[PDB]
Design a protein around this ligand. Structure first.
Ligand code: HAS
Ligand code: HEM
Ligand SMILES: CCCCCCCC/C=C/CCCCCCCC(=O)OC[C@H](O)CO
Ligand SMILES: CCCCCCCC/C=C\CCCCCCCC(=O)OC[C@H](O)CO
Ligand SMILES: CCCCCCCC/C=C\CCCCCCCC(=O)OC[C@H](O)CO
Ligand SMILES: CCCCCCCC/C=C\CCCCCCCC(=O)OC[C@H](O)CO
Ligand SMILES: CCCCCCCC/C=C\CCCCCCCC(=O)OC[C@H](O)CO
Ligand SMILES: CCCCCCCC/C=C\CCCCCCCC(=O)OC[C@H](O)CO
Ligand SMILES: CCCCCCCC/C=C\CCCCCCCC(=O)OC[C@H](O)CO
Ligand SMILES: CCCCCCCC/C=C\CCCCCCCC(=O)OC[C@H](O)CO
Ligand SMILES: CCCCCCCC/C=C\CCCCCCCC(=O)OC[C@H](O)CO
Ligand SMILES: CCCCCCCC/C=C\CCCCCCCC(=O)OC[C@H](O)CO
Ligand SMILES: CCCCCCCC/C=C\CCCCCCCC(=O)OC[C@H](O)CO
Ligand SMILES: CCCCCCCC/C=C\CCCCCCCC(=O)OC[C@H](O)CO
Ligand SMILES: CCCCCCCC/C=C\CCCCCCCC(=O)OC[C@H](O)CO
Ligand SMILES: CCCCCCCC/C=C\CCCCCCCC(=O)OC[C@H](O)CO
Ligand SMILES: CCCCCCCC/C=C\CCCCCCCC(=O)OC[C@H](O)CO
Ligand code: CUA
Ligand SMILES: [O-][O-]
Ligand SMILES: [Cu+2]
Lengths: 552, 166, 31
């Protein structure tokens, strides 16, 4: 193609998307089965005829976790948060590096997959020691995640190059977001990298007899929280800089948008103890500090809610809608690229609400490790992030391929988006509710059918969600292939501008402060030292490694 | 109109951001409170107390389950619980109602949950560490312990029992 | 005034509050 000759970043981007969705599809095959399980219905005999390599509910659960929460979300982030700044800056990302990042991701994913498919690493996506997986799982996962360090390089490159040609100009919006995002992702990433290099790899290679569980978990959750922000921000970039165009309006504030991002750089990483509220050997004063900081990181989404709601209202008003509710009907509800994100945001209301409870230190003892947690996150990632990614098919795919979306394809997109949204909501009810009834997360409950009689009601929701989502998923498979494998090509589509919104003047002072990135980067990194340093120093000073086990 | 909508949008967002901040602060204050009551007993002890999971069943307080329940105060019992694949010892745990129970829980294998159905006890149990938590059972009877951390193929059926005597 | 935006944050504030005091109530019942 002449267009790929001129915009090679289109094709690398496409590869990240497709691989991402393929990861999503396979990971998601296990969802309906898990939903049916949380409804006390056992359809694994079915799954095991259809996919004979699957040995247990927990192998399936690992695949689901790893492929949906690690692989898909990452590919997506790398697609969005590279290509978008590249288009706004109208500059070419380093193509050698972009390809390198892709191969790393693909290679690492392939290597990790082998043990997973072979049933040699049925730990889960959290891989907590001393459950001990195959070295290939840890190594494949490490190289997969490391793929992102290249992405970080790519975007800082593009950035500095733009600044050099444009001294004394403020960073453009998407690029500002992309930069604070990647720098955030860098600090965040170090927890897991540390964990894999100092403990998990030597351990799985047989170089050390055991790992200290508590240090593993503490390092893990260093990365483990900001990762969800690393998953979320690609969606927010789109929600902020694109959706307002799609809805028929404008972004009501660039500075507000920058502020939210900035806050995530500063606050996404020093918070991980909120996943360790029930852990021994971690001081309660530290748990409380981390809790307070977690309530703070809620703030940029509290902000986002308003910035975004106000933008959608503005779009709705521009298109004629009047009243308290009129601006809602006025929006482009026929357009899957608008619908998917907005619906995602609706679910995000109870989502963030669950998050907020989780954050509150003692309140966590009510819900910790119950079905409530899955209830919270499906709202956030399986719903908001996923739907946002889904709706990008309908504007990004054509932009990247020149492949057109038929009227028929659009209608199916709408169906897919709504059914997925709704199935996620139904499920969200069954899980939260089952969680409050003390049902454990990560558990093959259908195989202990008389264990949770009090959950009879939420169980019907989970079954229902289960069937609804299987339908939605089936229809997304057929949907995605129909576009991807489609005949027609209209190259005028690939040469179109991306639908970036215009901004509605102004706190230039604020924008300038927010643009002192190096400064904010350092601050954020200082916060991680202050919030993790004291505890890690004490943990490392008293390591207590323990034998690994394979209980599957 | 565009200029005006912008100022009004911005003006109210500040309203919201200050209220949201207030609300968050009040939650902080309400968590602080819980921290000061007995309800806070279920927060683990932040102190490191290392053990050897390879010998814990052969020597030390976890070696003989029938002696796990030790009176350590006038109205206080310490209980050495082992969480393991796939169950808890002793079974059952027997404690008096109204007494304050310092659970000291460890694992010989892998991580397990220790979630006492009906109560706020919900603590990760890591091999090599003793998790310490405290609770006063106010109502007598039978409480189920659920393992709520994946621990291998027997996870779904790993349950224990605490009996609280009148 | 951004009346619709405001209504979105009302719903959100109420959701947070139903959730939070909800769980706080459950924490104490189990305490
Ligand atoms: C991408 C996905 C994720 C996000 C986002 C996320 C958000 C939060 N999380 Fe979380 N969560 C926790 C804290 C929260 C808090 C404070 C937030 C906050 O960031 C939430 C703030 C968000 C809001 C306050 C919502 C704002 C509303 C918006 C933006 C929508 C407005 C609507 C509009 C505009 C539409 C209007 C349109 C119209 C047309 C009307 C805690 C603890 O403190 C735990 C551990 C609990 C335990 O015991 O394990 C945890 C665990 C999880 C797990 C489980 C990990 C595991 O495997 O063990 C995952 C996957 C995860 C995902 C995600 N989480 N969460
Ligand atoms: C087809 C749609 C989906 C359905 C039917 C569904 C349903 C399920 C169920 C019922 C659980 C809880 C299992 C348990 O606690 O034992 C679960 C686990 C999980 N879900 Fe999904 N799933 C969906 C798609 C996805 C998506 C797209 C995300 C990520 C973007 C996601 C990521 C996760 C992860 C990370 C877990 C927790 C795994 C663990 O504890 O190890 N799901 N989902
Ligand atoms: C288009 C996407 C939306 C899909 C929504 C589909 C609606 C689900 C079916 C409802 C009919 C009622 C079904 C009741 C018939 C059998 C139920 C039953 O007997 O329960 C199972 C069994 O007892 C234990 O294995
Ligand atoms: C072993 C794995 C090596 C990975 C194979 C690497 C092939 C890279 C191909 C690629 O996408 O790069 C363009 C290249 O110059 C060709 O046309
Ligand atoms: C990819 C990177 C993964 C890291 C693997 C090897 C690098 C260096 C590891 C060096 C192994 C240390 C061995 C050691 O010092 O052993 C301690 C022993 O347990 C006390 O007796
Ligand atoms: C480059 C590709 C692979 C790195 C090669 C690393 C090969 C390491 C294999 C060693 C191994 O399998 O050791 C595990 C043992 O069972 C202890 O638990
Ligand atoms: C902006 C960041 C500010 C962060 C600073 C916030 C204040 C936290 C201080 C002390 C909490 C006290 C914790 C003590 C709880 C112990 C209760 C206990 O030991 O119960 C058994
Ligand atoms: C128990 C939970 C399960 C039940 C699920 C309920 C959750 C909320 C669902 C939808 C709200 C969406 C509100 C906005 C709807 C947009 C449709 C609209 O306004 O249509 C106008 C017309 O099409 C001109 O374009
Ligand atoms: C009584 C409760 C019932 C149980 C819930 C059953 C679940 C789904 C039903 C089907 C919902 C299909 C909704 C998709 C509609 C759609 O695509 O609408 C486009 C719209 O005009 C612009 O968004
Ligand atoms: C939202 C859209 C509609 C969803 C679910 C219908 C709710 C029906 C659930 C009613 C409970 C039925 C049930 O299974 O009863 C419990 C138990 O058997 C008592 O004896
Ligand atoms: C046509 C599109 C609309 C249709 C949407 C459906 C309506 C929503 C409500 C319930 C469906 C429930 C289906 C659940 C299937 C069986 C539930 C089950 O297994 O129940 C066990 C029972 O409580 C103990 O034996
Ligand atoms: C190198 C690591 C990147 C971290 C530092 C990034 C902030 C910085 O110093 O950027 C200034 C910019 O290049 C001025 O035009
Ligand atoms: C139990 C606790 C009770 C909770 C009950 C729900 C409370 C709703 C939340 C916030 C209300 C804030 C709205 C007040 C309006 C702020 C005014 C403002 O900021 O306006 C500036 C502008 O200049 C003027 O024209
Ligand atoms: C403009 C207004 C400014 C005023 C702003 C104040 C907001 C008021 C809300 C909460 C205060 C916290 C009250 C703390 C009392 C908690 C007691 C409780 O809930 O008791 C539980 C249990 O019964 C014991 O063991
Ligand atoms: C829309 C979603 C609707 C959500 C619906 C909310 C329902 C859950 C309510 C409370 C959970 C609190 C459970 C507390 C358990 C108390 C049972 C108890 O005390 O049992 C043990 C005792 O030992 C016996 O002797
Ligand atoms: C528009 C999209 C926004 C979505 C907003 C969803 C927010 C969830 C709010 C309420 C659900 C709870 C239903 C009612 C509360 C149940 C309390 C209850 O019954 O408590 C049990 C108690 O033990 C007595 O039996
Ligand atoms: C709409 C889609 C989103 C999914 C919906 C999520 C539902 C969970 C919501 C709120 C739970 C709030 C806690 C409510 C617990 C009720 C019980 C109560 O109020 O507690 C008193 C009693 O002492 C008990 O034992
Ligand atoms: Cu022990 Cu799950
Ligand atoms: O992660 O919340
Ligand atoms: Cu987190």
């Amino acid at each position: 193609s002449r267009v790929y000759e001129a915009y090679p970043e289109k094709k690398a981007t496409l590869y990240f998307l497709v691989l991402g969705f393929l990861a999503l599809i396979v990971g998601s095959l296990f969802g309906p089965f898990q939903a049916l399980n949380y409804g006390n219905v056992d359809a694994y005999p079915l799954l095991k005829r259809l996919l004979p390599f699957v040995q247990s509910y927990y192998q399936g659960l690992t695949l689901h976790g790893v492929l949906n929460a690690i692989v898909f979300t990452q590919l997506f982030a790398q697609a969005i948060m590279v290509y978008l700044p590249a288009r706004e800056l109208n500059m070419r990302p380093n193509m050698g590096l972009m390809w390198l990042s892709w191969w790393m991701a693909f290679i690492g994913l392939v290597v990790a997959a082998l043990p997973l498919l072979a049933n040699e690493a049925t730990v889960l996506w959290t891989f907590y020691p001393p459950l001990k997986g195959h070295w290939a799982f840890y190594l494949g996962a490490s190289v997969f995640v490391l793929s992102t360090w290249v992405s970080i390089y790519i975007v800082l490159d593009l950035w500095r190059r733009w600044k050099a040609a444009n001294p004394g100009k403020v960073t453009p919006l998407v690029t500002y977001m992309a930069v604070v995002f990647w720098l955030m992702w860098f600090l965040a990433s170090l927890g897991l990298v540390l964990e894999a290099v100092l403990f998990l790899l030597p351990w799985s290679f047989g170089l050390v007899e055991g790992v200290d569980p508590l240090v593993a978990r503490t390092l893990f959750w260093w990365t483990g929280h900001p990762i969800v922000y690393f998953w979320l921000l690609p969606a927010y970039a789109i929600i902020y800089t694109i959706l307002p165009k799609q809805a028929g309006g404008k972004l009501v504030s660039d500075p507000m948008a920058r502020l939210a991002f900035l806050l995530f750089l500063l606050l996404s990483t020093p918070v991980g103890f909120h996943h360790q509220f029930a852990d021994p050997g971690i001081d309660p004063t530290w748990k409380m500090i981390h809790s307070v900081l977690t309530l703070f990181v809620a703030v940029p989404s509290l902000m986002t809610a308003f910035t975004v709601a106000a933008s959608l209202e503005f779009a709705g008003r521009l298109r004629g809608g009047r009243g308290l509710f009129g601006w809602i009907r006025a929006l482009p509800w026929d357009n899957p690229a608008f619908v998917a994100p907005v619906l995602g945001l609706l679910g995000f209301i109870p989502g963030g609400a669950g998050g907020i409870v989780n954050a509150s230190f003692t309140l966590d003892y009510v819900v910790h490790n119950t079905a409530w947690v899955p209830g919270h996150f499906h709202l956030q990632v399986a719903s908001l992030v996923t739907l946002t990614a889904m709706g990008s098919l309908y504007w990004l795919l054509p932009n990247l391929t020149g492949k057109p979306i038929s009227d028929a394809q659009r209608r199916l997109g709408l169906a897919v988006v709504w059914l997925w949204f709704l199935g996620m909501m139904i499920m969200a009810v069954g899980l939260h509710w089952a969680g409050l009834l003390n049902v454990p997360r990560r558990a093959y409950i259908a195989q202990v059918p008389d264990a949770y009689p009090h959950a009879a009601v939420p169980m019907v929701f989970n079954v229902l969600a289960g069937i609804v989502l299987l339908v939605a998923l089936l229809l997304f498979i057929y949907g995605l292939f129909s576009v991807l494998l489609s005949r027609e090509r209209k190259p005028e589509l690939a040469e179109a501008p991306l639908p970036f919104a215009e901004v509605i003047p102004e706190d230039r002072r604020l924008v300038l402060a927010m643009d002192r990135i190096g400064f904010w980067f350092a601050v954020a990194a200082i916060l991680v030292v202050l919030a993790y340093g004291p505890t890690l120093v004490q943990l490392f000073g008293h390591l207590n490694p323990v034998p690994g086990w394979r209980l599957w | 109109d565009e200029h005006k909508a912008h100022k009004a949008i911005l003006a109210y967002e500040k309203g919201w951001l200050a209220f949201s901040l207030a609300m968050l602060f009040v939650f902080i204050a309400l968590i602080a409170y819980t921290l000061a009551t007995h309800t806070a007993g279920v927060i683990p002890a932040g102190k490191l107390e290392r053990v050897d999971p390879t010998t814990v069943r052969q020597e030390g307080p976890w070696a003989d389950p029938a002696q796990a329940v030790v009176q350590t105060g006038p109205n206080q019992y310490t209980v050495y619980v082992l969480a393991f694949a796939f169950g808890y010892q002793p079974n059952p745990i027997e404690v008096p109602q109204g007494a304050e129970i310092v659970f000291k829980i460890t694992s010989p294998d892998v991580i397990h949950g220790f979630h006492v159905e009906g109560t706020n006890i919900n603590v990760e149990v890591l091999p090599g560490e003793v998790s310490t938590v405290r609770y006063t059972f106010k109502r007598p009877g039978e409480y189920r312990i659920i393992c709520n951390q994946y621990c291998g193929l027997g996870h779904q059926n790993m349950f224990g029992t605490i009996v609280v005597k009148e | 005034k951004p009346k619709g935006a405001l209504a979105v944050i009302l719903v959100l504030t109420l959701t947070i509050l139903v959730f939070w005091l909800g769980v706080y109530a459950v924490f104490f019942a189990r305490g």
